[PDB]
Amino acid sequence: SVKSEYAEAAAVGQEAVAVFNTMKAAFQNGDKEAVAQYLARLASLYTRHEELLNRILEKARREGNKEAVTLMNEFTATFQTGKSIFNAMVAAFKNGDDDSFESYLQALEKVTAKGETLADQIAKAL
Ligand SMILES: Cn1ncc(C(=O)O)c1-c1ccccc1
Numbered sequence: 873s874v875k876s877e878y879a880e881a882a883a884v885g886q887e888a889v890a891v892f893n894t895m896k897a898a899f900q901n902g903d904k905e906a907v908a909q910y911l912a913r914l915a916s917l918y919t920r921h922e923e924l925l926n927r928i929l930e931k932a933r934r935e936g937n938k939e940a941v942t943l944m945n946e947f948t949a950t951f952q953t954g955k956s957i958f959n960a961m962v963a964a965f966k967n968g969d970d971d972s973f974e975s976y977l978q979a980l981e982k983v984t985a986k987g988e989t990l991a992d993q994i995a996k997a998l
Contacts, residue, residue, distance in 0.1 A: 874931045875998040881924040882995070888917035889984070896977060904965075911962055918955060925951060932998065940997040947994055950987045954980055 895910035925948055932940040957980045964972035 873998075874928055874935070875995070877924070877931070878928055878995055878998055881921060881928060882991070884917060884921045884924060885991075888914055888921060891917065892980075899973065899977070907965060911965060914958065915962070918958060922951060922955065928998070937998065940994065943990060943994045943997055947987065947990050950983065950990070954983045954987075957983060 891910055891913050895907055895914065898906040898910060925944070929941065929944040929948060932944055957976050961973055961976035961980065964970075964976060
């Protein structure tokens, strides 16, 4: 079902959360080789998550589930904000701009924390 498909999508998002927090520790410790690998892993987790969320939104639309479509449109929009900040973080790492990396890291944390009440709403709505 679309609801179980969302819980799977939710688990992929939580894998990205776990890897992200590990990466943040590696950044603080100056272990740039670990960071590089974790950023590659995160990119793959975010790409997967994004595609899964699109399939869920499209299914909700086909089912005529207006409330779930509304919430998923809002949630996917916020997802794109996090993704843009993530991509900027990756660029800051490439460029060796630790100040920008710290900034973007904190911004990505706040954007993700804000989107959580909506994330739980969607589970109930599907
Ligand atoms: C509860 N829930 N349902 C979907 C998601 C997601 O990130 O897709 C989440 C979520 C997971 C970790 C942090 C914030 C939201």
